[PDB]
Scaffold this active site. Structure first.
Site, PDB file in Angstrom:
ATOM      1  CD  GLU A  12      25.923 -19.355   9.248  1.00  0.00           C
ATOM      2  OE1 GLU A  12      26.557 -20.078  10.299  1.00  0.00           O
ATOM      3  OE2 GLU A  12      26.071 -19.479   7.932  1.00  0.00           O
ATOM      4  N   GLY A  78      27.350 -22.776  -0.164  1.00  0.00           N
ATOM      5  CA  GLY A  78      27.870 -22.209  -1.389  1.00  0.00           C
ATOM      6  C   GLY A  78      27.285 -23.287  -2.448  1.00  0.00           C
ATOM      7  CB  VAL A 153      34.375 -24.777  -1.944  1.00  0.00           C
ATOM      8  CG1 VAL A 153      34.553 -25.239  -3.460  1.00  0.00           C
ATOM      9  CG2 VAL A 153      34.446 -25.933  -1.126  1.00  0.00           C
ATOM     10  CG  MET A 174      33.113 -24.913   5.739  1.00  0.00           C
ATOM     11  SD  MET A 174      34.241 -23.419   5.808  1.00  0.00           S
ATOM     12  CE  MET A 174      35.374 -24.132   6.974  1.00  0.00           C
ATOM     13  CD  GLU A 175      29.780 -24.827   9.645  1.00  0.00           C
ATOM     14  OE1 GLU A 175      28.803 -24.480   9.029  1.00  0.00           O
ATOM     15  OE2 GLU A 175      30.958 -24.121   9.658  1.00  0.00           O
ATOM     16  CG  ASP A 198      29.571 -18.763  -1.501  1.00  0.00           C
ATOM     17  OD1 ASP A 198      30.131 -19.538  -1.932  1.00  0.00           O
ATOM     18  OD2 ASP A 198      29.301 -18.615  -0.194  1.00  0.00           O
TER      19      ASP A 198
HETATM   20  C1  LIG Z   1      34.015 -17.835   7.236  1.00  0.00           C
HETATM   21  S1  LIG Z   1      34.060 -19.455   6.865  1.00  0.00           S
HETATM   22  C2  LIG Z   1      32.664 -19.749   6.030  1.00  0.00           C
HETATM   23  C3  LIG Z   1      31.406 -20.185   6.798  1.00  0.00           C
HETATM   24  C4  LIG Z   1      30.038 -19.976   6.247  1.00  0.00           C
HETATM   25  N1  LIG Z   1      29.493 -21.404   6.033  1.00  0.00           N
HETATM   26  C5  LIG Z   1      28.636 -21.897   4.819  1.00  0.00           C
HETATM   27  C6  LIG Z   1      29.341 -21.370   3.451  1.00  0.00           C
HETATM   28  C7  LIG Z   1      28.881 -20.656   2.497  1.00  0.00           C
HETATM   29  N2  LIG Z   1      29.648 -20.607   1.464  1.00  0.00           N
HETATM   30  C8  LIG Z   1      30.756 -21.625   1.484  1.00  0.00           C
HETATM   31  C9  LIG Z   1      31.489 -22.013   0.549  1.00  0.00           C
HETATM   32  N3  LIG Z   1      31.697 -21.479  -0.691  1.00  0.00           N
HETATM   33  N4  LIG Z   1      32.385 -23.093   0.909  1.00  0.00           N
HETATM   34  C10 LIG Z   1      32.209 -23.512   2.185  1.00  0.00           C
HETATM   35  N5  LIG Z   1      31.076 -23.078   3.050  1.00  0.00           N
HETATM   36  C11 LIG Z   1      30.493 -22.209   2.515  1.00  0.00           C
HETATM   37  C12 LIG Z   1      30.725 -22.306   6.243  1.00  0.00           C
HETATM   38  C13 LIG Z   1      31.315 -21.452   7.454  1.00  0.00           C
HETATM   39  O1  LIG Z   1      30.786 -21.481   8.482  1.00  0.00           O
END
Ligand SMILES: CSC[C@H]1CN(Cc2c[nH]c3c(N)ncnc23)C[C@@H]1O
Ligand SMILES: CSC[C@H]1CN(Cc2c[nH]c3c(N)ncnc23)C[C@@H]1O
Lengths: 237, 237
Positions: A12, A78, A153, A174-175, A198
């Site tokens: 990122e 997401g 999620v 998540m942040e 996604d």
């Molecule tokens: C390897 S853990 C995922 C990392 C990517 N960040 C964003 C993210 C993208 N899709 C998401 C989803 N479906 N649910 C929650 N978070 C995200 C959250 C984390 O740093």
């Protein structure tokens, strides 16, 4: 002025990291801070690590040690809003914890005790995000509520929970709420400018790894345009 | 040595606050730091506020600015072990996030991405807690797993989710995993020594209101004994 930029993952922050001139790297408590300038504006880029605790810890170190005037959260997310496609930008109007529940003591769902129910993105920073979007005319974005929790999620049940309790949600990650809450406690303006990797369903573990680079590219292009605008923004400068 | 002590709430820090000699109070980022000595040992007492983000940001500020040699997390908790009555003490063997889920990427339940699955309490600090317990023979205590989330646990459904996924859990609360993860990233030894205010069910809101003072009393008496032991024993330089 000094612009704080925060992303969780190496993937990122890579694009923006490579643009920093006279880069000075500091490693502390599992965080990496890159300081220098991007296109003639002072920046500090933080790679915080994943999740609410790492993001909060990193943001606290960022603010207390580097004193950025503003904070921009870059990265992936997401998608929940129907109009978003993979690669599209999502901008926070406000941020909430989708996984906070202190309703036992009268707080609304997602509101942490001792906190506002939501963390509102800074109005002036938002205007800059709008101007940046206007300079990227063939790109689609959605502004709205971004919800954060300590979970990836990827199930219908978790989607339903989040939509049922936060019906206006446009994306999850998540942040952001940890960054936003920390900025709120320090009284530092923030905005989240992420992009969709996604759609938070059973396919998202695969979609995420496939399209993380696309999301980073889209999010980083917007953040870079914001940096360029802030260079000559006389309110902030 | 310097002993860091962290509690979330005013009632949780009040007893120890009143013992600090030549107290110096600093307010920063919605946290309060009280520095001075308790019985001739340097202490820094952080009132962190409630929840994972406040605890993480406060702990990061504590460690980075005050460099305590150890961290003791005091306060109340919701009891899960069957033997616990209100006022009884819980000592962490380890701490986990009960609300973390990135199992889609191979991690076990409760493990945050980029983190170990559990945060182990320091062996010497656990020993000191046990020595303190021996000098407080009318305190009943259980040592074991403490689980944290951004929720006040007060329903059978939530209690059962946590038990299902973390069968050995002895108590739950809302800051310890943030403190523990932050201490892990800074490589600072920690232990949690809390006391029970409720048993994480439908009566918890009222039980918590009634028994928070008792829990603060019991946990604070243990922490004070631990401070006295640490002063004497030279376990930490
Ligand atoms: C390897 S853990 C995922 C990392 C990517 N960040 C964003 C993210 C993208 N899709 C998401 C989803 N479906 N649910 C929650 N978070 C995200 C959250 C984390 O740093
Ligand atoms: C006003 S929020 C509750 C505060 C007290 N802390 C410990 C705690 C006691 N009982 C608990 C339970 N049933 N579920 C989660 N946490 C706890 C957590 C927070 O600082």
């Amino acid at each position: 002025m000094k612009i704080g930029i925060i992303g969780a993952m190496q993937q990122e922050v890579a694009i923006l990291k490579d643009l920093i001139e006279d880069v000075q790297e500091v490693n502390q408590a599992g965080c990496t801070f890159y300081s220098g300038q991007i296109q003639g504006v002072d920046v500090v880029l933080l790679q915080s690590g994943i999740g609410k605790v790492s993001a909060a810890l990193g943001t606290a170190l960022l603010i207390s040690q580097y004193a950025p005037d503003v904070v921009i959260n870059t990265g992936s997310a997401g998608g929940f809003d129907a109009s978003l496609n993979v690669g599209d930008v999502v901008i926070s109007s406000e941020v909430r914890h989708h996984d906070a529940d202190v309703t036992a003591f009268g707080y609304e769902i997602g509101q942490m005790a001792g906190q506002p129910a939501a963390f509102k993105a800074d109005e002036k920073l938002m205007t800059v995000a709008e101007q940046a979007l206007a300079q990227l005319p063939n790109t689609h974005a959605v502004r709205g509520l971004i919800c954060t929790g300590d979970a990836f999620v990827c199930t219908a049940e978790r989607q339903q929970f989040i939509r049922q309790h936060f019906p206006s949600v446009v994306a999850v990650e998540m942040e952001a709420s940890a960054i936003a809450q920390t900025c709120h406690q320090f009284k530092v303006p923030f905005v989240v400018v992420r992009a969709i990797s996604d759609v938070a369903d059973k396919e998202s573990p695969l979609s995420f790894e496939e399209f993380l680079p696309l999301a980073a590219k889209s999010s980083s292009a917007m953040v870079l345009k914001m940096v360029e605008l802030l260079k000559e923004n006389l309110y902030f400068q």
